[PDB]
Design a binder for this molecule. Structure first.
Ligand SMILES: COc1ccc(CC(=O)O)cc1-c1cccs1
Ligand SMILES: [Zn+2]
Ligand SMILES: [Zn+2]
Length: 558
């Protein structure tokens, strides 16, 4: 407990003797509580061009820690042994070609410069002076200011913890440890437009149905034994790397210290996965790959109830399975953090639930012991909030495209993140959404129409700025004034490894749509008269946005 978190606790209070106090009205039942202190937007351009959706309930809803405060029961001793054998094998596999290394002040600085007031911090030497100071503590096995959150220079300590963590564990991302070529199951770096193609290739593998069980609150199901297993990566590091990462793991993951927001409460605990942390996506991916391997082993009858209970379980048959089949079983999977698709060798997997529940990874909204439902059509599998469609172009070439319910797309575009922003900033975010729809959702009739209308309305030379999304699967090819059909050709033809025939597409009329039925099943208002009204009267509202923006130069895109 206190030897490891105390310095961090003693600090923040001593700073906040202004308003520091205990409370017996704190609602913390499984996190340790230490104390507290007092401390205390619609996009008009897109809205006007999406009138029929003013109505729509999901659109109205988007414009407008009960599950975190639990304990996860400790996995059985056989489970713990299997997790351990499998983690060591996975890490050795992931490191077969790459070596871990430290990341640098320069790498991190160049990252900040191309992604929120931190830029001001990374051009101050005194920021790096505090990093150096905290790093020296870390090397001694201590920690002075690395705390998690759920113009006061408070912000330097926080950004400094993130650099320190990036320095010690960023190589998992920076060097693509979970790319599909290195990890087999991973998809990091692929981007949304490739995930569908990956699922289709998984469908070609012989075996059972395709399963996509999502976990109830994955980050809260990360156990002390999972953290122990994630940490075995340090055995592959150079001694000076090993020191700093051991520091991150022991003192920032296996022992966190948090603030929640009128009062701010500061709180600690020894398991679960922290909110922000740079290592969160890679370590979730790693542990999901492990858990699904273990579930496949159970599926194949390699692991039984008695094995999970057994404190003296023999390694040899786990090792053998892993050594002779592990890589093949990884190739049946697409795993991105807590998102997984698994195509097991048969459907016994659907009822292989002993090890999955015992490791804590309890599926959401299903009784613990009901068999999983798998899909026999890869186009029905959900993954990373999407499903994916095979489309036949007029020239007979096939695209695989991402799709999700249309009101979610329109409802996100209709929201401006932040107040005070000027019409030009609001027009430019709309263009970013409009052009993202051009690149990824061009196959949705209404979104290609709305996209054209928004781009008809904002100056053709204005550059879209600020992100449409934080997803790790987004490459933001739409943040540009390059012609969108040229980007479209680059993304879907030129750089498309699943597109053999490189013949460019010269017109949007040869960019296909979903079939009409499927378009309507996935939310289209096509066929509704109010949609046909909107479509007829769209040049009017375009003109109205032009006349408020001013006498800039516009292009028509209808
Ligand atoms: C997996 O890709 C996503 C998942 C979720 C979301 C919604 C959101 O996070 O804002 C967007 C995306 C992407 C849109 C465009 C390229 S990725
Ligand atoms: Zn620290
Ligand atoms: Zn769809």
């Amino acid at each position: 407990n206190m030897d490891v978190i105390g310095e961090r606790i003693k600090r923040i209070k001593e700073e906040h003797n202004s308003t520091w106090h205990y409370d017996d009205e704190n609602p913390y039942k499984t996190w340790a509580y230490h104390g507290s202190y007092e401390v205390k937007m619609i996009n008009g351009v897109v809205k006007l061009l999406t009138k029929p959706w003013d109505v729509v309930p999901m659109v109205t809803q988007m414009a407008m820690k009960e599950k975190v405060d639990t304990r996860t029961p400790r996995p059985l001793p056989g489970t713990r042994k299997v997790m351990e054998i499998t983690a060591e094998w996975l890490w050795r596999t992931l490191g077969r070609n790459k070596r871990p290394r430290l990341c640098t002040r320069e790498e991190f600085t160049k990252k900040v410069r191309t992604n929120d007031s931190a830029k001001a911090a990374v051009e101050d030497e005194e920021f790096w002076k505090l990093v150096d100071r905290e790093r020296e503590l870390h090397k001694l096995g201590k920690c002075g200011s690395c705390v998690y959150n759920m113009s006061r220079a408070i912000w330097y300590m926080w950004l400094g913890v993130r650099y320190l963590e990036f320095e010690a564990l960023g190589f998992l991302n920076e060097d693509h440890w979970f790319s599909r070529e290195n990890s087999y199951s991973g998809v990091e770096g692929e981007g949304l437009h490739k995930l569908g193609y990956i699922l289709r290739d998984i469908s070609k593998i012989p075996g059972g149905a395709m399963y996509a069980d999502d976990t109830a609150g994955w980050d809260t199901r990360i156990t002390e034994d999972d953290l122990h297993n994630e940490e075995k990566i340090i055995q592959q590091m150079d001694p000076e790397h090993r020191q700093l990462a051991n520091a991150i793991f022991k003192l920032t993951y296996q022992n966190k210290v948090v603030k929640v927001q009128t009062v701010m409460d500061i709180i600690s605990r020894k398991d679960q996965r922290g909110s922000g942390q740079v290592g969160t996506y890679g370590l979730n991916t790693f542990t999901n790959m492990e858990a699904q391997l273990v579930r496949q082993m159970e599926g194949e009858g390699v692991l039984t109830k008695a094995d999970l209970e057994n404190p003296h379980l023999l390694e040899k048959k786990i090792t053998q399975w892993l050594e002779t089949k592990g890589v093949e079983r990884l190739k049946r999977m697409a795993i991105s953090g807590d998102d997984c698709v698994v195509k097991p060798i048969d459907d016994r997997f659907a009822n292989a639930l002993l090890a999955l529940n015992d490791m804590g990874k309890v599926r959401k909204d299903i009784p613990q012991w009901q068999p999983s439902k798998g899909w026999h059509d890869w186009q029905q599998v959900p993954f990373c909030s999407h499903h994916f469609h095979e489309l036949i172009m007029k020239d007979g070439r096939k695209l695989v495209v991402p799709c999700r319910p249309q009101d979610e797309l329109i409802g996100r575009a209709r929201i401006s993140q932040g107040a005070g922003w000027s019409l030009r900033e609001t027009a430019c975010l709309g263009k970013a959404y409009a052009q993202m729809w051009s690149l990824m959702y061009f196959h949705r009739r209404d979104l290609r129409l709305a996209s054209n209308a928004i781009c008809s309305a904002v100056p053709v030379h204005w550059v879209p700025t600020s992100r449409t999304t934080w997803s790790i699967h987004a490459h933001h090819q739409w943040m540009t004034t390059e012609d969108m059909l040229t980007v479209w050709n680059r993304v879907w033809i030129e750089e498309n490894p699943w597109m053999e025939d490189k013949t460019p597409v010269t017109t949007w009329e040869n960019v296909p749509y979903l079939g009409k039925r499927e378009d309507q099943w996935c939310g289209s208002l096509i066929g509704l008269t109010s949609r046909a009204t909107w479509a007829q009267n769209i040049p009017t509202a375009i003109q109205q946005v032009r006349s408020l923006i001013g006498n800039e130069e516009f292009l028509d895109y209808m």
